[PDB]
């Protein structure tokens, strides 16, 4: 049976011990030839690998090249976010810009943003770099923690980045992660991903790429795109809503088997009328996914407990019924 972590404690320990000295090459990618970019990657790797769970996120200074790119991307993308964006995304950056400091002239840090997300939506960011496997990334998603990188895309191609960077995750992902319903929907995916077999890991991971990175929804009577990739690429932002690419109703099985492409735009899209429809369907899909047990999350301790015996189920149930009694007394007091 595949091994999976049980809580954040082993996640940092085992993952930071077995893995070591794994620098990224990315030579064939556009740019990545200047020695400065290599130094930044080394700086990010040392900050990431040596980081321990629960410690504050180290601050990283930014030179002119990255700040200038942030200003250009922020100004261009911000002027287009009025269209093709989703309701939660709009107020997402609106509060963030007023509080997190999102501006073209001012690129925010990680510690300040991480505090804001955890305080509001209970989300924390792990500044990881290099290659990320599937199980570890999904496991982090289960704990409601999103892996992130400190460096940004190469200045050679400001419009698009061959590999995900800070700006891509910050713009495409951060506004969506702020959504409470979406946050819970993402968390369920992580829990389901835990303990998934080799094929199952691919199956569940396939939905993320076709749902999180690229996604469509119909709210307020108009269709909008919520996928991080759709809102991250200016060219893809117009293409996603364009009728040229294929658009189909969201389907778990279809997305997990639908063929994909790399280094190219996307023509196959899945659209969900409401996020809740995706939520329960995945949970039903997860139930359909064979597993010798289940999984539960405890926010009181940020721990994960296996669900394989009735006694464990009763343990959680007892706490559940306690809340109802507390709420019932509150209802009696009120009115």
């Amino acid at each position: 049976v595949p091994w999976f972590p049980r809580k954040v404690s082993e996640l940092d320990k085992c993952h930071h011990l077995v893995t070591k000295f794994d620098p990224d090459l990315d030579l064939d990618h556009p740019g990545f030839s200047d020695q400065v970019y290599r130094q930044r990657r080394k700086l990010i790797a040392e900050i990431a690998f040596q980081y321990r769970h629960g410690d504050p996120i180290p601050r990283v200074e930014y030179t002119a090249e990255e700040i200038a790119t942030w200003k250009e991307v922020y100004t261009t993308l911000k002027g287009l976010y009025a269209t093709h964006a989703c309701g939660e995304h709009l107020e997402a950056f609106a509060l963030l810009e007023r509080f997190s400091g999102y501006r073209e002239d001012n690129i925010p840090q990680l510690e300040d943003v991480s505090r804001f997300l955890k305080e509001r939506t209970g989300f924390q960011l792990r500044p990881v770099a290099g290659l990320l496997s599937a199980r570890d990334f999904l496991a982090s998603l289960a704990f409601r923690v999103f892996q992130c990188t400190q460096y940004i895309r190469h200045a050679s191609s400001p419009m698009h980045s061959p590999e995900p960077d800070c700006c891509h995750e910050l713009l495409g992902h951060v506004p969506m992660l702020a959504d409470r319903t979406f946050a819970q929907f993402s968390q369920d995916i992580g829990l389901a991903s835990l303990g998934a077999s080799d094929e199952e890991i691919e199956k569940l991971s396939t939905l993320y790429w076709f749902t999180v990175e690229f996604g469509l929804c119909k709210q307020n009577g108009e269709v909008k795109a919520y996928g991080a990739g759709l809102l991250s690429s200016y060219g893809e932002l117009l293409h996603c809503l364009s009728e040229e690419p294929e658009i189909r109703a969201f389907d778990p099985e279809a997305a997990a088997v639908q063929p994909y492409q790399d280094q190219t735009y996307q023509s196959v899209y899945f659209v969900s009328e409401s996020f809740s429809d995706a939520k329960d369907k995945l949970r039903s899909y997860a139930s359909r996914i064979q597993r010798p047990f289940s999984v539960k999350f405890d926010p009181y301790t940020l721990a994960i407990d296996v669900l394989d015996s009735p006694q464990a189920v009763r343990r959680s149930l007892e706490g559940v019924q306690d809340e109802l009694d507390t709420l019932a007394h509150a209802l009696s007091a009120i009115g």
Binding site: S133, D198, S205, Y208, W209, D262
Partner: peptide, 18 residues
């Protein structure tokens, strides 16, 4: 990118099998 991850996980898992 998930395509490469899926094959990478599959080949790594089956590498020890043989």
């Amino acid at each position: 990118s998930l395509i490469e991850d899926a094959r990478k996980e599959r080949e790594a898992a089956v590498a020890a099998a043989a």
